[PDB]
Amino acid sequence: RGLGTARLQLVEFSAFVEPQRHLFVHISQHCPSPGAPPLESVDVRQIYDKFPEKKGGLRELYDRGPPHAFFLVKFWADLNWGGFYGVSSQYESLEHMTLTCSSKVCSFGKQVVEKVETERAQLEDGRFVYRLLRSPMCEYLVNFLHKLRQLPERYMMNSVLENFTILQVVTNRDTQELLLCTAYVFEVSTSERGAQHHIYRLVR
Ligand SMILES: c1ccc(COc2ccc3[nH]ccc3c2)cc1
């Protein structure tokens, strides 16, 4: 499938730096069409420890449901490049909604940043689109990225990134319904191979 539900679909996601653009990670679901197949599944239990077991932790979130709203993205990021560091997200749906978008940056399973944004639906092409464009990337991530690009060896970046995760929770602001919950894990790619990603379903 893709990263989305009947109610809300991710359309594009990127994290980038501008002085053109450099993209650290990118999901295009404009992609688009598959030809096949469905998404592989990963047992959400094997990643409880990469996020806080406190309130709003993975286990708590998944317990309430709905379980089909839960995805894991593995990113191989491109760190070969002080400009403007940005994140851009676009969702779409057929219903009119206001979204609450929470991003939780985690280091060794502890939250070091929570970022909460709100985005109202916008009618376009007979569907509703939710554009969170050019949101300044938090300072901790900028500083982290500047240190990460210093490491002399890709495998050392990977070692450092094995304890770094992001949890993104999109809820219907009005109703409090969870719409999408995405866990992100990270390695690095080469400049030659370019950034890449793999989306899974989280199951239990
Ligand atoms: C390591 C590699 C790439 C990057 C790109 O920076 C971001 C920033 C916000 C994000 N939200 C979901 C993935 C994501 C990525 C950060 C750290």
What is the residue type of 17?
Answer: V
Q: What is the resolution of this structure in A?
A: 2.1
| Number of folded domains that form the chain | 1
Residue of 189, 183, 154 whose CA lies nearest to 47? 183
Burial class (CB in 10 A: 0-12, 13-18, 19+), 55: exposed
Judge contact between 172 and 98, C-beta under 8 A.
yes
Paired sense of beta strands 127-136 and 22-28, if any: unpaired
Q: Residue 103 and residue 105: Cα distance in Å, rounded?
A: 6
Answer whether 109's CB lies under 8 Å from 116's CB.
no
Nearest to 138 by CA among 112, 108, 118, 107: 112
Structure tokens at 48: 């409880």
Residue 87 CB less than 6 A away from ligand 1: yes
Question: In whole angstroms, what is the distance from residue 81 CA to residue 78 CA?
Answer: 8
Q: Cα of 147 to ligand 1 centre, how many Å?
A: 14
Domain ranges, residue 38? 2-204
DSSP string for 154-178: HHHHHHHHTTEEEEEEEEETTT--E
Structure tokens at 102: 């929470």
Q: How many residues does the chain have?
A: 204
1: nearest Cα among 30, 36, 27: 36
What experimental approach yielded this model? X-ray
Q: Is the C-beta atom of 103 inside 6 A of ligand 1? A: yes
Q: d(Cα 75, Cα 187) in Å, to the nearest integer? A: 6
In the numeric block, the tokens 């197949």 are attached to 37
Ligand 1 neighbour 128 (Cβ under 6 A): no
Burial class (CB in 10 A: 0-12, 13-18, 19+), 60: middle
For a ligand 1 pocket test, name from 13, 25, 116 the mutation site with the most ligand atoms within 8 angstroms of its C-beta.
Answer: 25
Q: Which residue has the tokens 């094995």?
A: 162
CA–CA gap between residue 167 and residue 103 (Å, rounded): 6
Measured CA to CA, the distance from residue 149 to residue 74 in angstroms comes to 19
What is the CATH number for 113?
2.70.50.80
118-126 long-range Cβ contacts below 8 angstroms, 24+ apart: 118/173, 121/93, 121/95, 121/96, 121/97, 123/96
186 Cβ closer than 6 Å to some ligand 1 atom: yes
